[PDB]
């Protein structure tokens, strides 16, 4: 009886994917497991850190994709990024 990872992290976009499994929690790498990390793998508390870590010099040269910033562990992320955008 052992729980595997199944539901490993979440990849989205390919740079995304990369960038949780090199990133994590971008301070204290302790969260992806067999579900992610929720919803607070690039905000939750500043609310910015991915937005600074990917966006800033990777996709603000294009489009901001957001949904995994303004948020804790809510589905805030689609009610930010698809009620304010």
């Given at each position: 009886m052992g729980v595997t990872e199944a539901q490993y992290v979440a990849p989205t976009n390919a740079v995304e994917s990369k960038l949780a499994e090199i990133?994590?929690?971008?301070?204290?790498?302790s969260g992806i497991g067999i579900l992610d990390n929720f919803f607070q793998?690039?905000?939750?508390?500043?609310?910015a850190m991915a937005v600074a870590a990917?966006?800033?010099?990777?996709?603000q040269v294009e489009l901001p994709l957001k949904v995994?910033?303004?948020?804790?562990?809510?589905?805030a992320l689609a009610q930010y990024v698809a009620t304010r955008s």
């Amino acid at each position: 009886m052992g729980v595997t990872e199944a539901q490993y992290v979440a990849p989205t976009n390919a740079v995304e994917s990369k960038l949780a499994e090199i990133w994590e929690r971008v301070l204290g790498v302790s969260g992806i497991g067999i579900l992610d990390n929720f919803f607070q793998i690039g905000g939750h508390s500043l609310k910015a850190m991915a937005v600074a870590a990917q966006v800033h010099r990777e996709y603000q040269v294009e489009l901001p994709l957001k949904v995994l910033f303004a948020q804790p562990t809510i589905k805030a992320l689609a009610q930010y990024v698809a009620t304010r955008s």
